[PDB]
Each structure stands twice: as structure tokens, then as C-alpha cells.
DNA sequence: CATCCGTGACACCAGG
């Protein structure tokens, strides 16, 4: 089976920041740079 | 929150008596096909289906709204149990 | 249950020296350990999500 | 940014508002040009960011950058489970685990 | 917290003025900040409390919408019939509570307006709302606080 | 892959000429906010209304002065004038000056303004000021047509030397709240449901305001036609 | 004092890139117009994408082909980037046929041509065949809108066909700038510039027109109220 | 009235 990322799958970085994917927004809802490039992931600052 | 939960807690001397009353009333409604309801047709709880609004099938929502009307009497030693059973079977057949 | 597959990283006619990469294994990008993705993150709250 | 300055676009109005907010925050020096203050923010790792739902900017500059993120082995596809009724144990006649 | 905090600026730095039009003109020259504490004729105030005087919450928040002032600027607003020196954000928070509990007088009695909202003050708000209005209204208050806290934290920067 | 989209039912829920809820469901994923935000901006910035823009009160020099014989200061009077809901019956009229002269023991209301042709004061019961024995109030207020919100120190219009400029609260709309909730149509899962909430002052109604908003937006969409 | 219809400028670069300017617009209407158009451009612009692939002697996606360097997963990932423009408006499905052998880097050109069908990225790599490696593919391109994963459409024309994830949208990027501009004595006016990058299937101008039409059609939905 | 000794007890869910 080819498993895509879905709501409830667990991501983490190398510094101990772990978290479960709670929401997959469509591209047009994502915060984007002034030149129109949307961001991929939105991490909460309260985790730091 | 259950609509009017503060009032329901005001109606009883113990929060668990409210639960006993509501559950017994819900079983009474389930056994008699709701035919003994004290709610007028406009007070009936409704459920939105694909076609249109229908009667809420949740006997507990019904029992709590009935309690909220004031049209119900609750207490200990009101009537012998089988007397109540047979009178409700007469007034509302199954 | 994770897939362990190797993929060829060379092409026909290529000159290779001793110790040069020929096939990337699982979680390997051109011989570097590839355990994830490089994503573009913004660090901000988002409506409680 | 020099790319944009060459493609024929100046600094945006929302960028000006975010720069005003950043000046209030003590993040950029008051008096410099928009490009200078945007460069100061960028050196702090922060950029102007637009809310995709409204087009208005995030009131402050936001940290944005590339991060290495992995997908761990704990996927909900393997863990979601439910049961109405099912097999029971020999001696205890209780549900299996 | 972000919407209920007030700005404190250093430009004016406590200048003394006789007439408020002097302070307005000084701020217009660029010599005094909008939220810098000053003293006009003897009483401590700021330029923002004089330049902007709103007849009601709706006007203050309309001006906030049009970019005239920010939620963290100390301004003068007429709410509940009193002439309040407070930010539009604190007015907005008072209105959030009032709409949530559907009781304007009690909601005004519960809130501490002149303080930024944080863990302890919001906890005291939830407890007092409980005592005074019941768990159904307190649950609606909680969901309102959730909605607006998330909303304002998103765009706060 | 193949899609079918039922046209969404538009639902109105009003309470007088002051408030209304507007529900538009179902909408394809995302169009809730795509429709709500521009309409909100337009309803708050470009719906035509009226506003007090300048006030002259006899023997009053500046805005922060007190008035002998009246209990309120000039600031309070200017606030009450900001709350004046004036309606222009004639589409050609653009500006009026309203006269008000009273004295003695009396509480001036918005009724006491001398009537002017095709100027309907929607809220005549609006309190303005109270005077005492020996209190005199001679004032003229300036009412202009406009949109949005303009601070007093941005138009600064002065008919005479002591005409105090007033922050022009043009917009007939006082608040626009909107909220999108997820909704389903059968097994379509992420459809949107739009809910508008519009407060006005009575001069224009919420439904009228929303229709003017959608009209402005469509007319702006027409601007992509002639290179 | 009502501002009137603004000048609309169009700059283009091939079928790929486009800048669209509107000026002057009232304050805040730069965002009011630009953002919903951007959302609709990114979400609701119809287009084309590969939706199914059959390969001879290939039973499923997790396969290799002798003589072919790329596995089937990489071949489908490559085919996911195939831009296919339809010239006929009423065309819905095209079955591209590819047949190759020998030592060659099979690119997108090698697809046998079909009438009223153009491949916009012909240099797109497909496979790296060696001596004796044969590749015989039948790919299927459909018209569609938005993003539809293989698990939702499951399009198979023959038994051993592999459904493919389809990114139907032809819009690769949308930005918009709002700059300060003036008309006469009016200041704080908006100058809106939509920058649109597409794939070539549809041009930036066609996408802008379709998005404008979609937004106007959605504004139509407020026409029939209901208590 | 002490020391010595034998016998108890030592978090939950999950998968194992
Ligand atoms: Mg003022
Ligand atoms: Mg209080
Ligand atoms: Mg949705």
C-alpha cells in the first residue's frame, strides 16, 4: 500500500519537536510569501 | 451543555435523582411509543434528516424537555409499580 | 513492514571510481541519510489547529 | 528582493503596515527605507506573511524557513480500531485484547 | 492577552502641556507619540486619549477596522454611559464576554477591564461566570473565549 | 472525478431595519471566506451613508471647552451628534446644515432640529443635551454624504473660524460578523456554509446593505474587460 | 467624489506568465479584489492531468521493467508532470500511446500525436531505456478541476491499469501586489497587480477570466432570498 | 525490650 500523509499521522524534527497532523488545509488557505509562495508546514511557537 | 441543565439541577435535592427520573421517563416513552408524551406538537423535539424535520428519536432529550415543562410529577411512593404499569398499558397500548 | 528497496543512481557509460555510489537504498538521497522532507515552515499559531 | 525590484514592483502597502508594526516592536530601526527594514527583518529570519483567507498580512513578521521533518512510524492507519462484539476468552468469557 | 494589552511608547516621555490642542499639534509635528504618558494642564493622560474620542464601542471598532487606531492604543470610548480611557481591544473583550453570556450588566460586573487578560484573570472570570450565571452560560462563554483567542493569536504576529 | 453542484439556497433572518442573518449553503470548499471577506470589507468601507462632519456652537471656541448653563461638555455633545442617524430622501442632495436654538429648562432631543426639505431624522428621540435656568444653546451642525469613516483631522472642513470638525461616521453599517462552518451534502464532506451578520443604523437595512455590497463587487469584477 | 472605472493593463510572457493591473481603485479594494481572485485561481480553475496508466507486462504500481532504469513509481511521478492542452472545447478524454525501445532517454515528445492535443512540456523526462529495454504505455488524460487523488476516482480502462493522482489545476502560482497610487487630488488609492503563472494548458488571461466569471456567478447566489 | 528474618508489595493504556 502507498500511504499518503493523513490527519492523525505523526511528524517530528530532529530537535524533539513531535506532533500529530491535525489539519490539512487547501493551498489557498495557507499563509504565503508576498511573491505568492505558500508555506508547507505551520508550527506553533508555543512549543519552543 | 444540556439546555436548561441549571434549572433541572434546581428541581431536585440530589443531582442523581434527576438522572433516575429522566432515565425512567425515557424508558416509559420508549415502551409506549411516545404516545404518553406531555409535549404539544410544537414542543416536540425535532431531528433534521435529508428529506425534512422529523421527531427526535432520543427518548432522553424528550424526557428532559418534558421535565422542563413542569407537566411531570416525580417522587417516592406515588403509586404501586404494577398499578402504574397496567394503567399505562391501558391508556397507551403496545 | 517498511519498504526496503534500492534504486540505481548511475547510468550506462558512466566512469566510476572505487567507493562511488551505484544505488541508493531506503532513506538515502545520493548516499546521504534521507529520513524525511525539507518543508517550508512558518512558526505562528493557526486558529487553534 | 532585488529580483522583485527589477521585475517592476515596489514595496507593498501591507508590507508597509507590517513594517510599521515591526517598528513599534523595536525590530527595525525607525527612519530607514522599506527595503532596509525588510532586510533587517530578513536578517532576523522573519518575513512578511499574507493570510491566504483574507489577503491581509499577519500583523507581525513571522519566522519562515526550511526545516527537516520526518514522518514517524506511528500512523493512525495502524491504530484506529473499534468493536461492537467479538471473540471472548476461554476461562473468563471476557473480550480479547 | 495580545488584544487586551496596551502600548507604552517612549517618544513623548512626559512632556507638560497647557491646552490639549498644544499636545495634538505637538504629536502632529512628530514630537510626542500617541501612547506616551503626558500631562495636559495637570492631569496625566496621553495624546491618544484626546485625539480620538469615540461615542460608542461600534465606532471605535469601525475606526480600528479602517486602520485609524490599533486595538492596543489607549483611547477614550463611551461605554455603559461612562467616559472610559481604555483600548479598543479591551472594549472588544468586554463585548465578547457580554455577547457570550447574553447579559451586559453582569458581564460588565465580572470583567476586570483595566488589566491585560491572562491565565489568572480568565480563570477568575470563568469561576465568577459560573457562580453568577450557571454552567450552560459559562460553557458558551468558554467556547467564545476559545474562538476569539484562537482567532486573535493567529493574526497577532 | 465527475462533480455535481446544487445551487445554494439563500436564507434571510431579519429583526427590523437594524439586523439580519444571511445564510448561504452549500458552497464549494473555501468559497465561504472567499465570499465573506470582500463583502465584509465593502460593507464596512463603501456603503453610502450620512454623517455629522462639522459643528459650530455659539460662544464656544474649541472642542475641549465647557459651556455655561449646560451640564454636558462640548465633547459629549459632539458624541451625541456622532450618534445622529440622518437620512437623505433625495438622491441629489449632498450636504445640509441643521439649525438648533433652544434655552431654559429643557432636554434637547433630535426632534428639536428645524426640519429641512428631504432630511428625515430616523432617531428623533436621541438625546443631545440638557440645559438649565439660564442655559443657552445655539448650534449649527453640518451633515454630509459619504462612505466609510473619516477622522475629523482628515477633512478638517470649517465653514467659519469656530466650526469644530467631527469624525465623520458615514457608514450606515455598524458591524459585520461572518463565520464559515463545515457542512456536508450527502457524501460531499468539506462543503462550506456562510453566515453573515450585519448591524446598521436604520438609514439602510442589512439586506439593502448586502445587496449594495454585492452590486459594488460585481461592478468591480466588470473592470477586467478593456485593455 | 465617486471614483470611476480604472485602467486595466495586461502584460504577458508566452502562454505561461501574466501580469494584470487595475488602477486606480479605492482604498482597500486592492485586497478586496485580488485575494478572492487568487483563491479561485489556485482552487477552481479547470484543466488537464494524467489519470491512469497501463504498461505492458506491468501488473501494478510496485513493479520494475527490464532495461528501464526508473521503476513504475518514478514513471508515474514523471507522468504526473505532463501538461496536455486540449484544443477542442468539447473534448474530455485522450489516450496517449507511447512505444519505445533500445538505448534512449524517452521524453514526452515520443508520445504518438493526436489531433487537437498538444504537449506543452515536451522535454519532460519519462524513462531511461537501455539496450533491449522496451516501454509500451497507454496513458489517459482527462479534463477536471481541483485535486482528485487516485483513491477517489480509480480510473482504469483495462484490468492492469494503474490509477494516477491528478492535479487538474493549470495554475502554478498566483501573487498580487497592492501599490500606492493617486488620481488628481485623491491619495491612498490602490493599484492592484495580479501575477499569474500557469502551466501553458490555459493562459494566465484565460484563467483570470474564468476566475472572474466564477466569482460573478457566486455573487449571483444572493439574488433569491428566503425567510 | 531490642535485632534478625521471612514474606509481602512495588502506575495505566497500547502491543507483544
Ligand atoms: Mg478627535
Ligand atoms: Mg468590571
Ligand atoms: Mg470547509
Short mmCIF file of N, CA and C in Angstrom, two decimals, chain F residues 8-95:
data_model
loop_
_atom_site.label_atom_id
_atom_site.label_comp_id
_atom_site.label_asym_id
_atom_site.label_seq_id
_atom_site.Cartn_x
_atom_site.Cartn_y
_atom_site.Cartn_z
N UNK F 8 -26.84 26.95 -4.34
CA UNK F 8 -27.07 27.11 -2.89
C UNK F 8 -28.29 27.96 -2.58
N UNK F 9 -29.01 27.55 -1.55
CA UNK F 9 -30.20 28.28 -1.10
C UNK F 9 -29.76 29.45 -0.23
N UNK F 10 -30.32 30.63 -0.52
CA UNK F 10 -30.01 31.85 0.21
C UNK F 10 -31.12 32.13 1.22
N UNK F 11 -30.74 32.33 2.48
CA UNK F 11 -31.69 32.40 3.59
C UNK F 11 -31.48 33.69 4.37
N UNK F 12 -32.58 34.39 4.66
CA UNK F 12 -32.55 35.68 5.34
C UNK F 12 -33.29 35.55 6.66
N UNK F 13 -32.80 36.27 7.67
CA UNK F 13 -33.35 36.20 9.03
C UNK F 13 -33.15 37.58 9.66
N UNK F 14 -34.16 38.44 9.53
CA UNK F 14 -34.06 39.83 9.94
C UNK F 14 -34.85 40.09 11.22
N UNK F 15 -34.47 41.18 11.90
CA UNK F 15 -35.19 41.69 13.07
C UNK F 15 -35.26 43.20 12.91
N UNK F 16 -36.31 43.68 12.25
CA UNK F 16 -36.46 45.10 12.00
C UNK F 16 -35.53 45.59 10.89
N UNK F 17 -35.31 46.91 10.89
CA UNK F 17 -34.41 47.56 9.95
C UNK F 17 -33.01 47.75 10.52
N UNK F 18 -32.59 46.89 11.45
CA UNK F 18 -31.34 47.08 12.18
C UNK F 18 -30.40 45.89 12.13
N UNK F 19 -30.87 44.69 11.80
CA UNK F 19 -30.06 43.50 11.96
C UNK F 19 -30.63 42.38 11.10
N UNK F 20 -29.75 41.52 10.62
CA UNK F 20 -30.17 40.38 9.82
C UNK F 20 -29.07 39.35 9.72
N UNK F 21 -29.47 38.08 9.67
CA UNK F 21 -28.56 36.97 9.46
C UNK F 21 -28.78 36.39 8.07
N UNK F 22 -27.68 36.11 7.37
CA UNK F 22 -27.73 35.74 5.96
C UNK F 22 -26.93 34.46 5.76
N UNK F 23 -27.62 33.38 5.41
CA UNK F 23 -27.03 32.04 5.34
C UNK F 23 -27.04 31.57 3.89
N UNK F 24 -25.86 31.18 3.40
CA UNK F 24 -25.70 30.72 2.02
C UNK F 24 -24.95 29.39 2.06
N UNK F 25 -25.68 28.28 1.92
CA UNK F 25 -25.12 26.94 1.92
C UNK F 25 -25.87 26.08 0.92
N UNK F 26 -25.20 25.09 0.31
CA UNK F 26 -23.77 24.78 0.47
C UNK F 26 -22.89 25.46 -0.56
N UNK F 27 -21.64 25.74 -0.18
CA UNK F 27 -20.65 26.33 -1.07
C UNK F 27 -19.46 25.39 -1.17
N UNK F 28 -18.86 25.34 -2.36
CA UNK F 28 -17.68 24.51 -2.56
C UNK F 28 -16.58 24.92 -1.58
N UNK F 29 -15.64 24.00 -1.37
CA UNK F 29 -14.65 24.16 -0.30
C UNK F 29 -13.88 25.46 -0.45
N UNK F 30 -13.97 26.32 0.57
CA UNK F 30 -13.22 27.54 0.63
C UNK F 30 -13.99 28.79 0.27
N UNK F 31 -15.07 28.67 -0.51
CA UNK F 31 -15.78 29.84 -1.00
C UNK F 31 -16.54 30.58 0.09
N UNK F 32 -16.71 29.98 1.26
CA UNK F 32 -17.29 30.70 2.38
C UNK F 32 -16.53 31.98 2.68
N UNK F 33 -15.23 31.87 2.96
CA UNK F 33 -14.46 33.06 3.28
C UNK F 33 -14.18 33.89 2.03
N UNK F 34 -14.01 33.22 0.88
CA UNK F 34 -13.84 33.92 -0.40
C UNK F 34 -14.98 34.89 -0.67
N UNK F 35 -16.20 34.54 -0.27
CA UNK F 35 -17.33 35.46 -0.39
C UNK F 35 -17.46 36.39 0.82
N UNK F 36 -17.18 35.89 2.02
CA UNK F 36 -17.44 36.69 3.22
C UNK F 36 -16.51 37.87 3.38
N UNK F 37 -15.20 37.66 3.18
CA UNK F 37 -14.25 38.74 3.43
C UNK F 37 -14.44 39.95 2.52
N UNK F 38 -14.53 39.81 1.19
CA UNK F 38 -14.75 41.01 0.37
C UNK F 38 -16.04 41.72 0.71
N UNK F 39 -17.12 40.96 0.91
CA UNK F 39 -18.39 41.57 1.29
C UNK F 39 -18.26 42.32 2.60
N UNK F 40 -17.50 41.79 3.56
CA UNK F 40 -17.31 42.49 4.82
C UNK F 40 -16.54 43.80 4.62
N UNK F 41 -15.45 43.74 3.85
CA UNK F 41 -14.69 44.96 3.57
C UNK F 41 -15.57 46.01 2.91
N UNK F 42 -16.36 45.59 1.92
CA UNK F 42 -17.22 46.53 1.19
C UNK F 42 -18.29 47.11 2.11
N UNK F 43 -18.95 46.24 2.88
CA UNK F 43 -19.98 46.69 3.82
C UNK F 43 -19.43 47.64 4.87
N UNK F 44 -18.13 47.56 5.18
CA UNK F 44 -17.56 48.48 6.16
C UNK F 44 -16.91 49.71 5.54
N UNK F 45 -16.70 49.73 4.22
CA UNK F 45 -15.94 50.82 3.62
C UNK F 45 -16.66 51.61 2.53
N UNK F 46 -17.70 51.05 1.89
CA UNK F 46 -18.20 51.67 0.67
C UNK F 46 -19.71 51.73 0.56
N UNK F 47 -20.46 51.51 1.63
CA UNK F 47 -21.92 51.64 1.61
C UNK F 47 -22.25 53.10 1.91
N UNK F 48 -22.98 53.80 1.03
CA UNK F 48 -23.17 55.24 1.20
C UNK F 48 -24.10 55.56 2.37
N UNK F 49 -23.68 56.51 3.20
CA UNK F 49 -24.49 56.97 4.31
C UNK F 49 -24.35 58.46 4.53
N UNK F 50 -24.69 58.94 5.72
CA UNK F 50 -24.54 60.34 6.09
C UNK F 50 -23.76 60.42 7.40
N UNK F 51 -23.29 61.63 7.73
CA UNK F 51 -22.52 61.81 8.95
C UNK F 51 -22.40 63.28 9.28
N UNK F 52 -22.47 63.59 10.57
CA UNK F 52 -22.11 64.92 11.06
C UNK F 52 -20.61 65.12 10.88
N UNK F 53 -20.23 66.21 10.21
CA UNK F 53 -18.84 66.47 9.89
C UNK F 53 -18.29 67.76 10.47
N UNK F 54 -19.14 68.70 10.89
CA UNK F 54 -18.67 69.94 11.48
C UNK F 54 -19.78 70.52 12.34
N UNK F 55 -19.40 71.12 13.47
CA UNK F 55 -20.35 71.65 14.44
C UNK F 55 -19.85 73.01 14.92
N UNK F 56 -20.70 74.03 14.81
CA UNK F 56 -20.44 75.34 15.40
C UNK F 56 -21.46 75.58 16.50
N UNK F 57 -20.96 75.85 17.71
CA UNK F 57 -21.80 76.20 18.85
C UNK F 57 -21.42 77.61 19.28
N UNK F 58 -22.42 78.49 19.38
CA UNK F 58 -22.16 79.89 19.66
C UNK F 58 -21.43 80.05 20.99
N UNK F 59 -20.45 80.96 21.00
CA UNK F 59 -19.65 81.31 22.17
C UNK F 59 -18.75 80.16 22.64
N UNK F 60 -18.52 79.16 21.79
CA UNK F 60 -17.64 78.04 22.10
C UNK F 60 -16.43 78.13 21.18
N UNK F 61 -15.24 78.24 21.77
CA UNK F 61 -14.02 78.44 20.98
C UNK F 61 -13.48 77.12 20.44
N UNK F 62 -13.11 76.20 21.33
CA UNK F 62 -12.52 74.93 20.93
C UNK F 62 -13.35 73.77 21.48
N UNK F 63 -12.92 72.55 21.14
CA UNK F 63 -13.70 71.34 21.39
C UNK F 63 -13.70 70.94 22.85
N UNK F 64 -12.63 71.24 23.58
CA UNK F 64 -12.47 70.81 24.97
C UNK F 64 -12.90 71.89 25.96
N UNK F 65 -13.65 72.89 25.50
CA UNK F 65 -14.18 73.90 26.39
C UNK F 65 -15.44 73.39 27.09
N UNK F 66 -15.78 74.05 28.18
CA UNK F 66 -17.06 73.82 28.85
C UNK F 66 -18.06 74.88 28.39
N UNK F 67 -19.33 74.62 28.67
CA UNK F 67 -20.41 75.51 28.27
C UNK F 67 -21.15 75.96 29.53
N UNK F 68 -21.29 77.26 29.76
CA UNK F 68 -22.13 77.72 30.88
C UNK F 68 -23.60 77.47 30.61
N UNK F 69 -24.31 76.99 31.63
CA UNK F 69 -25.73 76.73 31.53
C UNK F 69 -26.10 75.35 31.02
N UNK F 70 -25.12 74.56 30.59
CA UNK F 70 -25.35 73.20 30.11
C UNK F 70 -24.49 72.26 30.95
N UNK F 71 -25.04 71.09 31.28
CA UNK F 71 -24.32 70.16 32.15
C UNK F 71 -23.23 69.39 31.40
N UNK F 72 -23.50 69.01 30.15
CA UNK F 72 -22.52 68.29 29.36
C UNK F 72 -21.46 69.24 28.83
N UNK F 73 -20.25 68.71 28.63
CA UNK F 73 -19.24 69.47 27.92
C UNK F 73 -19.45 69.33 26.42
N UNK F 74 -18.65 70.07 25.65
CA UNK F 74 -18.79 70.06 24.20
C UNK F 74 -18.49 68.67 23.64
N UNK F 75 -17.55 67.95 24.27
CA UNK F 75 -17.19 66.61 23.79
C UNK F 75 -18.40 65.69 23.80
N UNK F 76 -19.17 65.72 24.89
CA UNK F 76 -20.35 64.87 24.99
C UNK F 76 -21.38 65.22 23.92
N UNK F 77 -21.54 66.52 23.65
CA UNK F 77 -22.47 66.95 22.61
C UNK F 77 -22.01 66.44 21.25
N UNK F 78 -20.70 66.48 21.00
CA UNK F 78 -20.17 66.00 19.72
C UNK F 78 -20.35 64.49 19.60
N UNK F 79 -20.23 63.75 20.71
CA UNK F 79 -20.51 62.32 20.67
C UNK F 79 -21.96 62.05 20.31
N UNK F 80 -22.88 62.73 21.00
CA UNK F 80 -24.30 62.56 20.71
C UNK F 80 -24.61 62.91 19.26
N UNK F 81 -23.93 63.93 18.72
CA UNK F 81 -24.10 64.28 17.32
C UNK F 81 -23.52 63.21 16.40
N UNK F 82 -22.43 62.56 16.82
CA UNK F 82 -21.92 61.41 16.08
C UNK F 82 -22.96 60.31 16.00
N UNK F 83 -23.77 60.15 17.04
CA UNK F 83 -24.79 59.11 17.01
C UNK F 83 -26.07 59.51 16.27
N UNK F 84 -26.11 60.67 15.63
CA UNK F 84 -27.31 61.13 14.93
C UNK F 84 -27.47 60.38 13.61
N UNK F 85 -28.60 59.69 13.45
CA UNK F 85 -28.89 58.91 12.25
C UNK F 85 -29.78 59.77 11.35
N UNK F 86 -29.16 60.43 10.38
CA UNK F 86 -29.84 61.31 9.44
C UNK F 86 -29.95 60.61 8.10
N UNK F 87 -31.11 60.72 7.46
CA UNK F 87 -31.36 60.08 6.18
C UNK F 87 -31.75 61.12 5.14
N UNK F 88 -31.18 61.00 3.94
CA UNK F 88 -31.45 61.91 2.83
C UNK F 88 -32.44 61.24 1.88
N UNK F 89 -33.65 61.81 1.78
CA UNK F 89 -34.67 61.24 0.91
C UNK F 89 -34.39 61.49 -0.56
N UNK F 90 -33.62 62.53 -0.88
CA UNK F 90 -33.40 62.91 -2.27
C UNK F 90 -32.01 62.48 -2.70
N UNK F 91 -31.87 61.72 -3.79
CA UNK F 91 -30.54 61.22 -4.18
C UNK F 91 -29.59 62.30 -4.66
N UNK F 92 -30.10 63.49 -5.01
CA UNK F 92 -29.23 64.55 -5.49
C UNK F 92 -28.62 65.36 -4.35
N UNK F 93 -29.31 65.45 -3.22
CA UNK F 93 -28.81 66.20 -2.08
C UNK F 93 -27.49 65.61 -1.59
N UNK F 94 -26.55 66.49 -1.25
CA UNK F 94 -25.23 66.07 -0.81
C UNK F 94 -24.78 66.66 0.52
N UNK F 95 -25.38 67.75 0.99
CA UNK F 95 -24.95 68.37 2.23
C UNK F 95 -26.06 69.26 2.77
#
